Amino acid sequence: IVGGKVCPKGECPWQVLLLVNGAQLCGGTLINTIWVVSAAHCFDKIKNWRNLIAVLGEHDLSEHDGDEQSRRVAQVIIPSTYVPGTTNHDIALLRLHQPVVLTDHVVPLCLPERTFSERTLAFVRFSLVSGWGQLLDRGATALELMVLNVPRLMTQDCLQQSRKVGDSPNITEYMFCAGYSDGSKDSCKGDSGGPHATHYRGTWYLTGIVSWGQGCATVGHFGVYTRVSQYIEWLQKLMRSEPRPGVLLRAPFP
């Protein structure tokens, strides 16, 4: 995260840290005790599928304070429509082998219903984006969980407010723009898979996933987030399914 602040310990309790061989991979969002939502592109290079760990209740990477809970990832579900190395359908649904224990420091983010998310959450201007990603473009990643408040834009507004760049992906119906075009504040590649959380009448909801952009906090460009409301039914059906052998699962979308 560029231009945010440290998320006070326990204030981003749904934040997940994904690790592969103990190394920082991506962020994710806890949506209940066994399920995590992240970005499909986080898994484009994984070979050691059996060494994927989700850490809940994490804050400071340099110290173990006892609030951290680790879980092996049993399944990584990706939509059939997602193409590795591209932008569209950037979502992954992760099944933990065993449930996390909710505590003051580990709480899931509400996955909303579709209509509610499209008709109400989609018009809440500001939302929080968080992670242990880069504090600067081409800079060090954060040791403490960072958080940033970003405004959401209508895609028409996003396109006309962004710099004219040749060979750039389209902002599809499965995406939304959020952030600033002045290069002061953004989520970064190390924040990929993390939550874009929206507050509505005293409750926080999952509305987006840190997905992509054209350089972190780059002038003339906004951050691009996966539009989670397009996946509610796909996610709900998968959470009702039995797991299959092999960590990676490609599931039909829609």
Binding site: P8, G10, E11, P13, W14, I31, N32, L102, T103, D104, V106, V107, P108, L109, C110, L111, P112, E113, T115, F116, R119, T120, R201, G202, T203, W204, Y205
Partner: protein, 58 residues
């Protein structure tokens, strides 16, 4: 058949469902129950989703 949820989420704190006529039913996410006002959602569990305990206990 009236459309109620299209307007300010039918007054529901969380989820809204339209029924035949002028009937509207608010609903909540798991870990919550609907209050007798038929609009508000209250936790049924100690760690309901989307609530920050250190801030809730402040």
């Amino acid at each position: 058949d009236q459309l109620i949820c299209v307007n300010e989420n039918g007054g529901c704190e969380q989820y809204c469902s339209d029924h035949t006529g002028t009937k509207r039913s608010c609903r909540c996410h798991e870990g919550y129950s609907l209050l007798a006002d038929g609009v508000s959602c209250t936790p049924t569990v100690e760690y309901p989703c989307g609530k920050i305990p250190i801030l809730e206990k402040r």
